[PDB]
Amino acid sequence: DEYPLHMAAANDDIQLIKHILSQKTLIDARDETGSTALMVATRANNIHAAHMLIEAGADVNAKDNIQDSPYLYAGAQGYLKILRMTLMHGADLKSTNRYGGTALIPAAERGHVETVRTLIAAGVNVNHVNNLGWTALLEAIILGNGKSNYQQIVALLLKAGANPNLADKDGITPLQHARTRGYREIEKLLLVAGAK
Ligand SMILES: [Cl-]
Ligand SMILES: [Cl-]
Ligand SMILES: [Cl-]
Question: Is 12 helix (H, G, I), strand (E, B) or coil?
């Protein structure tokens, strides 16, 4: 077919991938959509194919036509095994998705606690503001449900040093957002971090 590495990647077919890679052509060849084979594997959470492609030098920061990269997408989706691989193989922690967010912001949004922990530890900037005017902290409050995972993510962000006073575009602070929603645990965490 036209793009056999991409199909092999979609299928997690690592014997076929091994054979194609032995031909010594460009690992990041684009298919008809502009996607790399590693991007195809990552969208599918095909851990084994992603590992083989990454070890062979596929660029974890190459982008597709919606500004996803393997690193960015694995972080947003909580595909933590692939994400860890990307972090060991050149993830650009300053890179941003189509919303202008780091990988950390969607991980927080979606309540992916261990992905948040991992990204904090790696050094993603906790104070980054996306093109919705939101930080990881703001999204965890506004787009979470105030429970369990989101309390844990708030706590992680604040202990790591996220500024609790970085407000949304309209000047509404994390503290006000928590108060408006009656999120008492998150309010208390914010106040001890110096929120106003
Ligand atoms: Cl996973
Ligand atoms: Cl984002
Ligand atoms: Cl997670």
Answer: coil
